[PDB]
Design a binder for this molecule. Structure first.
Ligand code: FE2
Length: 849
């Protein structure tokens, strides 16, 4: 024989678990970095605890399968390695192997040790005339009894599903079969089974009828992407709804641990819903704060002295894990909030028309604006005569002081723009306005000035039917005003728009278009692409922690009594309205250039840098996003073409073909007959599909997510709901608008209690964990032994670092006013790198928060 030398790196559960790690939380990657010696439970791993068994890649047994070595136990502790790193522990193991058994390509592992551990890697050396073999594992290994068929890990090498090494073919297939899981059964914590189900788990019909919520997906009225199957028992009152639980399953390895408490952000969110909200609600159902803001100064005091609570309410939020690192305190009565970047230079610049318009290009929701093609604008609604008979903005509403073009000449010269929030809310408005909320369906028209800035020209506030449903829109239109009560009216008009925009952003731009729509791709990938497949490795970093934050959203955010329903305009109709909007979702229109063209914000042009020409040059989201889109596309093209020799080779790949078919027909299965799905008959289609997935998971989510507190941490700038209609004529509220307009604004928008909820949640959502892995050429360890892919990944990051410098440069260009605004807030949201915390920058690989 020979002895093959193995090095196993693993991490203990205590080093990664929230419950244990609450006493470990300030400047991590550290602490004499855990080498595995003096606190030392490392001896427990040594005797008859953990067995590893190598599987030959080149020598088969009687019936095709790779030859098994001898199950071998960990024989010793390695105290130090130059590459060790925090929280890790290393073990030496030596394997009996000969020439005649060939080359290992996989291994089985059994944990007999009761407590699960996180296996990081195996390195094998001293194999004659062959280099070292590396296994990247990154998986939790539960007790061996729990399993039926052992945990298996493959070496570093990427192989197309000709399945390469013949002795390994059956091992590759069987593990893919184990991951699919059969389709029945209640899922358990230690399981790694990926499957699909509809969104039937958000409501709570056992609590009553008013807690039931419609099934989303699997029907034509409310189509939806699928989510991860959790197979709990159904509810008593409804066989089609899944019963609620405080713990939701996701396939183990999709839930990431952290070395630092304070990086456990989903745990912080869960605490805000469960512990913090009922406590804070007790103080309003009490007394110790007034239930309403009375001035703008009272809102600003949130970031100064904070808001005063009593000791025992604030002593029950001061020592909770994670939240004591993200909440401030002055002694023992003040809950305080960090000042949002929007007011750091100017307290009042958000009120400006310039800033209002600039946030449509560079704000939290910079994706919706479109170029006005024809005039007035029109609705896509079926047969009511605002749709059948348009918006009520006329041509004489739009002649202020700037140009004196006709409406027709501004349209000709691409100078008129539209923010249309009319259609999604319109069919639900009567129901919405029968509750505590009072809302309008809005449209706004914007004009590109000669200085390259945008200004709002008209706001249409539309209502549905004083009598009827047929006969269309009851609309009022409002015009900019500099002074008098008319400016206060105009400011309230803008508030009704932003309230529409905030809610659309939350449910559609953020929840639907990134979180919900990405989840079926994670499921399809794991069920059908082996860990060894090139395309699995390309896509994998972009899925990190997404099923985790989504499972928490189902539990705490988007559920029947939850945060979004209590905080935002659409209320109890929030999620189902986003299913209505999903009717219009098309995969290939999510590609940044396609999106820009569809909204008329760009035109096709070969002489321009990225092949498109921008109507509106200073559109910060778009100009910056186009650099990042191209860096992603180039990376994915170079990668894809490393592996697929021809279009036939891709057509022959059974794992890719099965992946895509199940994606289209099951995961986004309500859209299975749509003609725009790429077939996967061409390498170019694989490039485009992968580019769209990575764009979505990385920069699109970053752009739409990390500005939420910096722009909307002042509730005055991004209100989430409205609760009064416009003061009319000779009202007592109109007169109140004359004498005390701050109080009239405050009475229209989100109340104080729901403001505190909104701020606490979006402060968490807008934070980067310290162990975030960024686009900025980052990966976890050493994912492949293919050096051509490593070099190509290297070029991807050098391109990203060069793009970061180009973007910083643009922020210092005085000509580019939309990048900063009157609010002097440089657009850094698409800068790839970031440090940690409430940073208005940084593009994570994945939807991680
Ligand atoms: Fe998010």
């Amino acid at each position: 024989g020979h002895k093959i030398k193995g090095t196993v790196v693993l991490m203990r559960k205590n080093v990664l678990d929230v419950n244990s790690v609450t006493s470990v939380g300030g400047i991590i990657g550290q602490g004499l970095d855990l080498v595995g010696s003096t606190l030392d439970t490392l001896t427990a791993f040594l005797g008859r605890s953990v067995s590893l068994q190598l599987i030959s890649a080149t020598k088969a047994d009687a019936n095709g399968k790779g030859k098994l070595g001898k199950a071998t136990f960990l024989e010793g502790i390695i105290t130090s390695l130059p590459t060790l790193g925090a929280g890790q522990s290393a073990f030496k193991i030596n394997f009996e192997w000969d020439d005649g058994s060939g080359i290992p390509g996989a291994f089985y592992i059994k944990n007999f040790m009761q407590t699960e551990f996180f296996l990081v890697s195996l390195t094998l050396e001293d194999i004659p005339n062959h280099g070292s073999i590396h296994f990247v594992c990154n998986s939790w290994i539960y007790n061996a009894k729990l399993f039926k068929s052992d945990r298996i890990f493959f070496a570093n090498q990427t192989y197309l599903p000709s399945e390469t090494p013949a002795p390994l073919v059956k091992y590759r297939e069987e593990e893919l079969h184990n991951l699919r899981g059969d389709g029945t059964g209640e899922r358990k914590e230690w399981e790694r089974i990926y499957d699909y189900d509809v969104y039937n788990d958000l409501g709570d019909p056992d609590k009553g009828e008013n807690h039931a919520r419609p099934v989303l997906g699997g029907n034509d009225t409310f189509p939806y992407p699928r989510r991860g199957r959790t197979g709990r028992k159904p509810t008593r009152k409804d066989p089609n709804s899944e019963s609620r639980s405080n713990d939701v399953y996701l396939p183990r390895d999709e839930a990431f641990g952290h070395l630092k408490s304070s990086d456990f952000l989903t745990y912080g969110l869960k605490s805000v819903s469960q512990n913090v909200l009922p406590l804070l609600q007790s103080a309003f159902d009490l007394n110790f704060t007034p239930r309403e803001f009375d001035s703008f100064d009272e809102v600003h005091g949130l970031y100064s002295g904070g808001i005063k609570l009593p000791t025992d309410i604030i002593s029950k939020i001061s020592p909770l894990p994670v939240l004591k690192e993200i909440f401030r305190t002055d002694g023992e009565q003040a809950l305080k909030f960090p000042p949002p970047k929007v007011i750091q230079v100017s307290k009042s610049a958000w009120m400006t028309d310039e800033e209002f318009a600039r946030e449509m290009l560079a704000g939290v929701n910079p994706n919706l604006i479109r170029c006005l093609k024809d005039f007035p604008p029109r609705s896509k609604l079926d047969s009511q005569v605002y749709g059948d008979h348009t918006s009520q903005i006329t041509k004489e509403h739009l002649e202020p002081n700037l140009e004196g073009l006709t409406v027709d000449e501004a349209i000709q010269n691409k100078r008129l723009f539209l923010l249309d929030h009319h259609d999604p809310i319109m069919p639900y408005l009567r129901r919405i306005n029968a509750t505590s909320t009072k809302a309008y369906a809005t449209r706004t028209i914007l004009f590109l000035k000669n200085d390259g800035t945008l200004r709002p020209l008209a706001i249409e506030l539309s209502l549905p039917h004083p009598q009827g449903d047929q006969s269309g829109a009851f609309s009022q239109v409002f015009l900019p005003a500099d002074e008098g009560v008319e400016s206060s009216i105009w400011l309230l008009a803008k508030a009704y728009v932003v309230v529409n925009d905030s809610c659309y952003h939350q449910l559609v731009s953020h929840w639907l278009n990134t979180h919900a729509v990405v989840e079926p791709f994670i499921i399809a990938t794991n069920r059908h692409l082996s860990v060894v497949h090139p395309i699995y490795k390309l896509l994998h970093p972009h899925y990190r922690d997404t099923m985790n934050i989504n499972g928490l959203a189902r539990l705490s955010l988007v559920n029947d009594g939850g945060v979004i329903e209590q905080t935002f305009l659409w209320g109890r109709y929030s999620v189902e309205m986003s299913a209505v909007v999903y009717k219009d979702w098309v995969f290939t229109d999510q590609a940044l250039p396609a999106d820009l063209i569809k909204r008329g914000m760009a035109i096709e042009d070969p002489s321009c840098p990225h092949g498109i020409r921008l109507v509106i040059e200073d559109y910060p989201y778009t100009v910056d996003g186009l650099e990042i889109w191209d860096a992603i596309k180039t990376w994915v093209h170079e990668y894809v073409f490393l592996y697929y020799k021809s279009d036939d080779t891709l057509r022959e790949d059974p794992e890719l073909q099965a992946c895509w078919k199940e994606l289209v027909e099951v995961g986004h299965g309500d859209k299975k007959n749509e003609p725009w799905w790429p077939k996967m008959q061409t390498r170019e289609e694989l490039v485009e599909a992968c580019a769209i997935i990575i764009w979505t998971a990385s920069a699109l989510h970053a752009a739409v997510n990390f500005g939420q507190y910096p722009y909307g941490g002042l509730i005055l700038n991004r209100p989430t709901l409205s609760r009064r209609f416009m003061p009319e004529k000779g009202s007592a509220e109109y007169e109140e608008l004359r004498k005390n307009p701050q109080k009239a604004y405050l009475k229209t928008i989100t109340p104080k209690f729901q403001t505190l909820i909104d701020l606490s949640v979006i402060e968490i959502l807008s934070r980067h964990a310290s162990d975030e892995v960024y686009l900025g050429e980052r990966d976890n360890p050493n994912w492949t032994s293919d050096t051509r892919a490593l070099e190509a990944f290297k070029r991807f990051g050098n391109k990203l670092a060069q793009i970061e410098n180009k973007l910083s440069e643009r922020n210092n260009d005085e000509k580019l006013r939309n990048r900063c605004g009157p609010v002097q807030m440089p657009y850094t949201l698409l800068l790839p790198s970031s440090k940690e915390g409430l940073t208005f920058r940084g593009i994570p690989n994945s939807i991680s928060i």
